C-alpha cells in the first residue's frame, strides 16, 4: 500500500 | 486522502484471464475466418477502440457472436487477444505484419505504435 | 520472449470503471440492507473470494440481484466497491471498522491485511 | 514497454  | 495498493490492477487482470482460461462468464465469441474466440465484453471494450463501438451499440450489445472482418489473421487476433489479458505482447519476426494489421482494426493504439517502432529499427 | 505494456492492467480498470459509472454491461445489483450496487459479475468475482464462490455456483451464476448479510454496513460496501474497480481505498477513522468487517465478509484479504495493521498502529 |  502507498500514498497515491 | 485513500490509499492504494499498487498490484491491484495487475492481480484483477490475471483472475480475469483464470476466468478467461476455465471459460467461466465469457458472454461473446469472436469468430475469425474458422477460428472462434471465447472472451469477456467488458474486457474487450475496456482494451479496443472497434469491441467499445460495437458493444456499446444498442443493437450490437446483445449479440452473442461477432465476426471480424475476413482479411484478420487468427494468430494476429490471438496473439492480441492473450495481450489483452494480461499485459503480454508475443512480437515476433514473423508476425509483426499481421499484429500490427490487427491492432489497427481493433484500434489498440499503444500496440499500433510498439508495432511501428519495431518496424522502423528493423 | 514477450514485451510488457506497464501501464495495461491499470488503463483496463480505468476503463471497466468507466463502464460502471456509466452503467454499461453491469449484469448484477448486490442489495446491502436498502442500497443498491449496480456491477460487473467478472470484477466482484476477481477482487472478492465470496463473489468467486458465489458466481461460480451453476445456480448463483445466473441471478441479477444478489442479497448481502443484514449486518453489512452499505457504506462499507461502497468504499470496497470502489476500491475494486480503482485500486484506492478510502479508509478513514470513523469506517475503519465497518471496511475491516464488510472485507472478512467478502474475502478481500489484502484490505484485510491493511485495516489490521492501521488498528494495531492505533 | 518493458521486457518482463
Ligand atoms: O487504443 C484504444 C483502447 C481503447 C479502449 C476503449 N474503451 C473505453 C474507453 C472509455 Cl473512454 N471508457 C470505457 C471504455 Cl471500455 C475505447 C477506445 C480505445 N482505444
Ligand atoms: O482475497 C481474495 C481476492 C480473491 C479473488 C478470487 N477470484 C479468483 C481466484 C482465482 Cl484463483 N481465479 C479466478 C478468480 Cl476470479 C478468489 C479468492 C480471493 N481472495
Ligand atoms: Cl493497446
Ligand atoms: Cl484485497
Redesign the interface.
Do not use: E, Y
Given at each position: 500500500?502507498?500514498?497515491? | 486522502?485513500?490509499?492504494?495498493?499498487?498490484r491491484?490492477?495487475?492481480?484483477?487482470?490475471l483472475?480475469?484471464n483464470r476466468?478467461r482460461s476455465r471459460d467461466?462468464?465469457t458472454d461473446v465469441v469472436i469468430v475469425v475466418s474458422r477460428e472462434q474466440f471465447r472472451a469477456?465484453?467488458?474486457?474487450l471494450?475496456?482494451?479496443s477502440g472497434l469491441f467499445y463501438s460495437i458493444?456499446?451499440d444498442q443493437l450490437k450489445?446483445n449479440l452473442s457472436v461477432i465476426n471480424l472482418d475476413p482479411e484478420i489473421n487468427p494468430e494476429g487476433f490471438c496473439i492480441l487477444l492473450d495481450?489483452?489479458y494480461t499485459?503480454?505482447?508475443?512480437?515476433?519476426e514473423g508476425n509483426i505484419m499481421a499484429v500490427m494489421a490487427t491492432a489497427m482494426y481493433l484500434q489498440m493504439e499503444?500496440?499500433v505504435d510498439?508495432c511501428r517502432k519495431f518496424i522502423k529499427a528493423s
Open positions: 500500500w502507498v500514498i497515491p | 486522502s485513500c490509499i492504494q495498493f499498487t491491484h490492477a495487475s492481480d484483477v487482470l483472475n480475469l476466468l467461466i462468464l469477456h465484453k467488458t474486457v471494450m475496456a482494451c458493444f456499446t450489445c495481450f489483452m499485459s503480454r505482447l508475443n512480437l515476433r499503444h500496440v510498439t
